[PDB]
Amino acid sequence: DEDETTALVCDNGSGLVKAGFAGDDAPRAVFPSIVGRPRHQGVMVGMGQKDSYVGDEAQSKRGILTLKYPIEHGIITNWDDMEKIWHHTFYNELRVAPEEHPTLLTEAPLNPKANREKMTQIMFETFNVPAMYVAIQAVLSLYASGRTTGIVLDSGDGVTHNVPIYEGYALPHAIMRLDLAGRDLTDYLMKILTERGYSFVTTAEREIVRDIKEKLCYVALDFENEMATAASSSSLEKSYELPDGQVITIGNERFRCPETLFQPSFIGMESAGIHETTYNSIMKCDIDIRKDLYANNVMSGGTTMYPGIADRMQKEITALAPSTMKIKIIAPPERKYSVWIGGSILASLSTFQQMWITKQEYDEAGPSIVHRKCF
Amino acid sequence: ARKLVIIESDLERAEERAELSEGKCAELEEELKTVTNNLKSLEAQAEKYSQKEDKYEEEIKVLSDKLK
């Protein structure tokens, strides 16, 4: 546009595909990372079904679709279907050719080595990308919120990651990975829903569970005191008319499921709560470096949007943590797009040149170019 | 005689959708008044809660100074 040339920003997860044009502050066309076929055989003739039904077109009509998700936190059940997800991204919504503008993707911390080389194969050899990089999830948001000294816990629907990044990344481990977010809460509901004459059976309607979840479901401050309150039918049940037509008086259902977050013992996992793992990462660093970590805590992700998420942390942490200085948690009121706001940062930096992979660089160091320069 | 039936039938359709619409519209109009009243009521309570927690903000502050 008579400014520069070849530039773009992108970001994908287990919820939405955040992307936009060149030099933007916020996304432009986010869409669900879904994709399925036809369990209904799509009037076979009222088109040769194909196109699994990805994008707004897919999210619009769920019934015909057997929504089979490709990338469940880390593991990619299949790469063949990924081919026609990015074919919908750059060409339909972004309206730009990938054989021109760079690309800034996100990296699920500690992702299988074999996956990186496989992805690069899809871009460089097929979609011809002469410049691109895959930054590491959390570290991005750090520079956006305006923090240089804090501990980041960025996670939404993908995977939980405790990234203590306030003066260095890639160093002692002090990081954790937990497959317990988003889809885990989306699949657990139908189970407990059975006791209330409800059952979102198939995957298509399972996706709706998440929709209603993010508009009412809240977290209990103390399950004990709210157990006796159950008698008082006022703060619990609330009339929610299902778009089709079937009221669901969610009440105790709201604060029962989220309890699993702090208590992973409800789904057969010894994984400690997100406030225990926090200790595990802090106890590794030096002794004279905790007082500043407690001062500011970066809690990001769409998972940190439900009522009663930050106040609970300040109750459990103080217990098994030093009690002398003040403790404050920085949870950006809109901390979901924290990664994208940070993506816009690195997207406009020139120092970033010493990170991405140039067309020729791949052929000069084989497929291992990724893990030979990056880390 | 047949044309009469066509128009007479339309009268039944018109009368049916009229009484049905007006019936629900009246019910809706009455409901709005109840919801509007609840809005005004809740808004009033929220105002009292807002001014109260603000009074605690200046109270917890002055107490912190005296404690220091």
Binding site: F31, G146, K328 | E58
Partner: protein, 116 residues
């Protein structure tokens, strides 16, 4: 600093009027333009004070000198409060259609004075 001995204030104004009238800016048009400038002055004179909304040491932004921020919305003739709901607080949604403004973020002081 305001009053200066070197430059005459009252003597220049009448000369400025001549310059505007000579070119093609009659008083009728001048007044119509001053409203636009005067509006900015109202939205200018507002360096908000400390907003004790946070807990520890940090803070956000809130109006204490209301009549000043009110003047900003006075020329606009809109809900003084609603005005600050969209500015001091950054609202973003987007996706599918295009954006829906209401839910927002109380930004820090640096970004606050920045937007100011």
């Amino acid at each position: 600093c305001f009053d200066v001995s070197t430059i005459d204030d009252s003597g220049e104004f009448k000369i400025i009027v001549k310059a505007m009238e000579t070119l093609g800016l009659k008083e009728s048009d001048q007044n119509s333009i001053w409203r636009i400038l005067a509006a900015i002055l109202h939205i200018g004179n507002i360096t908000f004070a400390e907003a004790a909304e946070q807990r520890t040491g940090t803070t956000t932004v809130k109006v204490s000198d209301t009549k000043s921020l009110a003047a900003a919305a006075s020329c606009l003739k809109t809900d003084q409060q609603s005005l600050s709901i969209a500015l001091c607080y950054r609202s973003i949604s987007t996706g599918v259609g295009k954006r829906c403004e209401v839910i927002s973020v109380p930004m820090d002081c640096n970004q606050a004075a920045y937007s100011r």
